[PDB]
Amino acid sequence: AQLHASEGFWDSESEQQEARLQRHAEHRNDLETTWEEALREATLARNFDVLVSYLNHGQNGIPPSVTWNFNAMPYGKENPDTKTFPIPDHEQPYRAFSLGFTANNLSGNWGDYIDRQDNKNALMRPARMMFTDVFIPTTK
Amino acid sequence: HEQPYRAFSLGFTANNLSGNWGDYIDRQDNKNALMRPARMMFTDVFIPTTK
Amino acid sequence: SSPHMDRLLGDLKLLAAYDSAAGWQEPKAMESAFQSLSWDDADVLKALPQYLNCRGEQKRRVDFAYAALCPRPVDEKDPKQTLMSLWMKARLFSYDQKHPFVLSPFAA
Amino acid sequence: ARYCYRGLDHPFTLNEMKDFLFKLREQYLVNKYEGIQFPFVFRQFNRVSTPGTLEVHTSPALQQQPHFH
Amino acid sequence: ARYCYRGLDHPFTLNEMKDFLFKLREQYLVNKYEGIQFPFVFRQFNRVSTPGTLEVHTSPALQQQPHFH
Amino acid sequence: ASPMLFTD
Amino acid sequence: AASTIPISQWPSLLYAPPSSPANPAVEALPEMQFDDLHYPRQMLLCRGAGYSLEQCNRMAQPDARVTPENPAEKLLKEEAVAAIACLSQREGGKDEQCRYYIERMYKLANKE
Amino acid sequence: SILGAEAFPELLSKVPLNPQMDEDKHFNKYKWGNEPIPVNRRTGSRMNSSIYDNRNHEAVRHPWSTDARTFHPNDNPEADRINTQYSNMVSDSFPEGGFSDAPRFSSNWERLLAYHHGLYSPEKFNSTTKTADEIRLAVNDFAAKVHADDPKNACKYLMIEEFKCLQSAQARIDPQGAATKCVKWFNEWRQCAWDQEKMVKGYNYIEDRRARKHKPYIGAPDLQYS
Amino acid sequence: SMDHGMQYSSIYWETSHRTYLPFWASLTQKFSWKIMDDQIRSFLRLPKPVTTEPFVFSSGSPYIRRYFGDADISVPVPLHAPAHFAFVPTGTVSPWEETGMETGPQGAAARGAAATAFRAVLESAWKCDIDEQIKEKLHS
Ligand SMILES: CCCCCCCCCCCCCCCCCC(=O)OC[C@H](COP(=O)([O-])OCC(O)COP(=O)([O-])OC[C@@H](COC(=O)CCCCCCCCCCCCCCCCC)OC(=O)CCCCCCCCCCCCCCCCC)OC(=O)CCCCCCCCCCCCCCCCC
Ligand SMILES: CCCCCCCCCCCCCCCCCC(=O)OC[C@H](COP(=O)([O-])OCC(O)COP(=O)([O-])OC[C@@H](COC(=O)CCCCCCCCCCCCCCCCC)OC(=O)CCCCCCCCCCCCCCCCC)OC(=O)CCCCCCCCCCCCCCCCC
Ligand SMILES: CCCCCCCCCCCCCCCCCC(=O)OC[C@H](COP(=O)([O-])OCC(O)COP(=O)([O-])OC[C@@H](COC(=O)CCCCCCCCCCCCCCCCC)OC(=O)CCCCCCCCCCCCCCCCC)OC(=O)CCCCCCCCCCCCCCCCC
Ligand SMILES: CCCCCCCCCCCCO[C@@H]1O[C@H](CO)[C@@H](O[C@H]2O[C@H](CO)[C@@H](O)[C@H](O)[C@H]2O)[C@H](O)[C@H]1O
Ligand SMILES: CCCCCCCCCCCCO[C@@H]1O[C@H](CO)[C@@H](O[C@H]2O[C@H](CO)[C@@H](O)[C@H](O)[C@H]2O)[C@H](O)[C@H]1O
Ligand SMILES: CCCCCCCCCCCCO[C@@H]1O[C@H](CO)[C@@H](O[C@H]2O[C@H](CO)[C@@H](O)[C@H](O)[C@H]2O)[C@H](O)[C@H]1O
């Protein structure tokens, strides 16, 4: 996971773009400062070879042409960006079942591990405390 | 003699000196760090958040 | 081959160093500066008594230049500061009486 | 109370002026956005209106700002 | 269970791969930042560490983005 | 001196 | 001991600076002046009067409203000249070779 | 013919112009050593400050490309700050050499358009911090001009103080931050203007009789106020 | 995404904090004597406030009161179209241009008398040195 972070995999497209812009700006400023210095020296010396020599005063590799990140990978139960061919039912997994006179797991849906949702509906969300045996509130 | 006074409440049951709620803009938690996770225990009624 | 310019720039650097050492509480450094402040210049030594007795336009030019360089008023009780000020003013007076100053932006 | 009954021509200092303008802004926001609550205005109420299918997601990590070294 | 005992050479689809990487990222963040909690990782615990003088302020209004008309 | 350098 | 000065106390720091081995004249800090408008204003006034650029440049004079001169340069003249001679002869007073004149001047100026 | 023989006494006699030079050239004439000014305080870019801003602690955006590495103020300074002069204090809130967000315009019309829209001023972008001496010179000139304008004015020193605070807070390069500090003296000047006007033009009001409970306690003294 | 927000902080009452409300508070209601006082003043011909007169004598410039449906709610509005004056010449300033870099009086003045004086001092010293060089060259 740390290796991915070095390559910017966990970063967002905004962060990648900002890093790219930062490199661009640093390079631009270095270039313009070097040009000012070279022009001043070549003007006080009245020689073009000084300008020429200032062309090698600063080349490891190059900046990456494209970048790939984790947020670019699609996710979703209904999202068709993940559906190529239908998966057979005898290979799809089952959801847990709980039913009794005291409790069940069918009056609501908690969602997936990433895309979660409130199990209680809108009318009873303000009274969630009333549907619990224990309740540990937030810290604020 | 021109600065205003802060409210005073003191009794065997409750007071307003064990904490500071702050101003209208710059507010702060009246309970200290050790008892903030147990704020429920310092209330007669508690209406939790919606999440 | 440029003694006047060299010693001018050196004296300016030494004034700056004295100020910095005073700010940072460094007697050793500030005394080093004071000692290195080019006291063995015959021209400035000879111009010193002339500046101490000058008057009028020349004095006003020299004082204008010295306020441009060092506008802060030194303490009237610190002889080291007083002496460095006198030395800088005498140097400027020598430069001026050799080749006068032209302080106005308008000129031709 | 300070101007008309105590004789102060300048009752509010800078802090009091800022407090007045803060409360004015809160009034504006409350009357502009229906149901606005704590994070934006000092106000809390329990009976709120929710969509019906409330999704819960993790917030994005804080933006990496460039820094020296 | 899918690869070694059912014979599937490609057990994970794109969704399962994303879930695996999400959990990997959460592990990294949890071990990197001490005490990180829900908004950034799916995790809640009560006994938290607070500074001692906790200030409460209203959040800034949402940034006005330029729009047509 | 000016009256605003006074603090006591 | 020397605690940080917040940004709100800088205006007072400018006209009442802390003590240093080389302090300025705090009583005279409000009197330090150097006008950047001297020559522009002079030229404007003369050209409005009706003079030419050459006449204006010939009539121009340096500003007299500058930081006042140190009265020591006129009161301690002889002692200062003697100290400067001692310095010129003894390499800037290394290893306390002008302490005599410097201490005489210090006493004259301070008086305990 | 060597260049600059008599021009480097700092080098000949090991005289350091500052603790940084002392530490570098190993002269070792500063008894207290040197605590280096880090790069984030030596240079950087303008940043947003208010907590009621969403892009707080983020660099200010300009029409031109800019390095987004910000100047960080000294938030946890050491107890001993031996040099408490303005020179060493200003580095905790501004960079002496100015910010690193200055543009090099490829053309003149870009400069024109930026200025026209309020996104560029050379006074603000191509400049350094003002030294204490310069600040004092400006303040004293302004004070002389104000005194010449009107000696028998009550808000004179208030105007001088707002000018002084702007100059000290470096309003040339941080106008918003400096106004945040000087608006109080502006407000005091406003009040003094009204007060002077009402004293000149006799403006008074009928005061009501004394309240029955003007004193909270009979034994308390009722200090008389004009 | 600001309207219709959720309850972000908890609502509670600390133990033994007072309420200062009796059991008939809901039947209680407010009252102001201002309406009755105005009726009585109008009926008895008591002194009226000057806000009843639209013209404003509280300044030298003409002001007229604008009323919002009642004499008690008014704002003064100025009538004059004020003429403004500028004792300034036109075309004498180009703020976008950096003037400290151009050579000339305007350039030196956008710079300062201190820089100009320093430049003049350098000029004088350089002239001294060059005069020495001229002497030693022409004496040969
Ligand atoms: C695709 C299509 C799909 C379609 C759908 C298909 C569906 C799938 C396929 C289905 C295929 C069909 C299969 C069949 C259906 C499956 C059903 C099934 O499996 O169930 C699952 C489902 C549970 O599954 P689950 O996933 O675990 O659900 C969550 C849990 O249940 C949650 O648990 P909880 O947190 O809610 O706690 C519940 C708690 C509940 O505990 C209690 O209710 C006990 C309360 C007792 C209070 C009084 C006790 C006094 C005794 C004192 C003893 C002396 C002192 C000792 C002190 C310590 C003891 C107190 O614990 C218990 O349940 C204990 C149960 C074990 C004890 C059973 C006792 C039986 C005694 C019977 C007595 C008979 C007397 C007859 C006399 C006739 C009259 C003359 O069943 C339930 O609904 C659970 C509740 C069952 C009700 C039991 C109530 C017993 C109460 C007896 C009281 C006796 C008092 C008599 C008084 C009258 C005389 C005066
Ligand atoms: C810069 C320097 C500054 C320095 C500082 C300077 C400070 C300022 C200047 C100071 C100058 C000095 C001034 C003097 C100091 C000021 C002190 C002051 O003003 O106080 C303020 C301060 C309160 O001010 P605050 O701002 O309002 O504070 C917040 C509120 O207090 C919060 O209220 P809460 O939410 O906590 O609720 C409290 C609740 C508390 O309510 C209760 O505690 C009552 C509980 C009763 C339960 C049992 C009742 C059974 C009766 C049944 C009746 C028949 C059935 C009817 C059914 C309906 C009725 C149940 O309500 C009451 O308090 C009711 C009080 C009114 C009734 C009083 C009854 C007195 C009876 C006395 C009996 C004597 C018997 C002698 C027999 C001797 C033995 C032979 O004082 C307090 O501390 C409040 C608590 C006072 C304690 C009262 C406890 C009475 C309990 C009587 C029980 C009798 C049972 C006997 C049994 C034994 C025989 C078997
Ligand atoms: C241990 C220490 C000993 C040393 C003592 C040291 C202390 C010495 C100094 C004295 C203490 C001073 C301390 C400073 C005090 C400052 C704090 C303070 O006072 O306020 C705090 C505290 C703070 O409250 P808060 O939230 O800030 O609200 C403030 C409001 O202003 C007030 O809130 P509120 O207005 O909401 O509360 C009033 C409440 C209670 O107000 C009243 O009830 C008025 C009082 C009337 C009393 C007489 C009626 C009695 C009837 C009894 C008959 C029952 C049936 C008989 C059954 C017998 C078998 C059991 O009203 C109600 O809850 C609803 C009742 C509405 C009806 C009332 C009018 C009708 C009456 C007739 C009944 C008719 C029913 C018809 C139904 C409709 C049919 C169509 O104030 C109160 O709690 C007020 C009520 C306190 C009651 C305490 C309960 C215990 C009372 C017994 C005390 C001890 C008795 C001793 C023996 C004598 C009795 C045998
Ligand atoms: C085997 C059948 C017989 C045994 C019955 C077992 C118990 C039955 C469960 C409770 C039935 C009512 O359930 C109630 O309606 C649906 C249940 O999905 C939920 O409603 C929620 O999910 C539905 C999805 O269909 C959404 O449209 C709705 O917006 C949302 O609020 C409510 O949160 C629940 O309170
Ligand atoms: C008139 C005096 C006699 C009557 C006494 C009245 C009751 C006394 C109040 C409780 C005393 C203990 O109070 C306890 O210490 C201080 C009170 O400011 C608070 O502590 C809090 O404020 C202090 C400020 O000084 C902070 O340094 C501290 O970090 C913070 O936690 C605690 O939240 C409180 O629990
Ligand atoms: C159906 C029957 C109706 C019966 C009507 C009876 C009417 C009685 C009206 C008396 C009103 C008196 O009202 C009260 O009197 C006193 C003096 O008298 C006034 O005066 C008092 O307060 C003011 C200042 O606060 C000052 O004049 C003075 O400090 C004090 O004497 C009060 O300002 C006024 O509030």
XYZ file of N, CA, C and O in Angstrom, chain A residues 21-22 24-26 28-29 32-33 36, chain H residues 65-69 100 102 104-106:
80
model
N 1.082 20.659 -12.024
C 1.193 22.109 -12.126
C 2.359 22.639 -11.305
O 3.042 23.581 -11.718
N 2.581 22.067 -10.124
C 3.673 22.513 -9.271
C 5.019 22.269 -9.939
O 5.898 23.142 -9.939
N 5.509 21.997 -13.175
C 5.540 22.943 -14.283
C 6.006 24.321 -13.829
O 6.865 24.943 -14.463
N 5.451 24.808 -12.721
C 5.754 26.159 -12.266
C 7.186 26.275 -11.767
O 7.874 27.258 -12.064
N 7.648 25.296 -10.987
C 9.042 25.306 -10.554
C 9.985 25.335 -11.750
O 10.944 26.118 -11.786
N 9.392 26.338 -14.839
C 9.276 27.619 -15.525
C 10.064 28.707 -14.808
O 10.776 29.498 -15.440
N 9.936 28.776 -13.483
C 10.633 29.813 -12.733
C 12.142 29.637 -12.820
O 12.878 30.614 -13.008
N 13.241 30.871 -16.296
C 13.224 32.315 -16.500
C 14.319 33.007 -15.696
O 14.950 33.956 -16.181
N 14.561 32.553 -14.466
C 15.672 33.099 -13.695
C 16.999 32.860 -14.402
O 17.843 33.765 -14.492
N 17.328 35.294 -17.303
C 17.706 36.634 -16.870
C 19.195 36.701 -16.554
O 19.900 37.619 -16.996
N 0.929 31.168 -13.811
C 1.394 29.989 -13.094
C 2.234 30.409 -11.898
O 3.096 31.285 -12.009
N 1.987 29.782 -10.753
C 2.651 30.163 -9.519
C 2.996 28.928 -8.702
O 2.201 27.989 -8.608
N 4.190 28.939 -8.119
C 4.571 27.930 -7.143
C 3.674 28.029 -5.918
O 3.572 29.089 -5.294
N 3.024 26.921 -5.574
C 2.010 26.898 -4.532
C 2.570 26.585 -3.152
O 1.793 26.411 -2.208
N 3.886 26.500 -3.008
C 4.477 26.294 -1.695
C 4.403 27.590 -0.904
O 4.922 28.623 -1.336
N 7.142 34.705 -3.425
C 7.667 34.094 -4.640
C 6.598 33.915 -5.709
O 6.690 32.994 -6.527
N 5.624 36.316 -8.034
C 5.680 37.435 -8.963
C 5.631 36.934 -10.405
O 6.196 35.882 -10.714
N 6.238 37.077 -14.658
C 7.039 37.550 -15.783
C 6.118 37.521 -16.996
O 5.953 36.477 -17.632
N 5.517 38.663 -17.309
C 4.508 38.707 -18.356
C 5.152 38.565 -19.727
O 6.150 39.224 -20.032
N 4.569 37.701 -20.557
C 5.070 37.503 -21.911
C 4.760 38.685 -22.816
O 5.355 38.800 -23.891
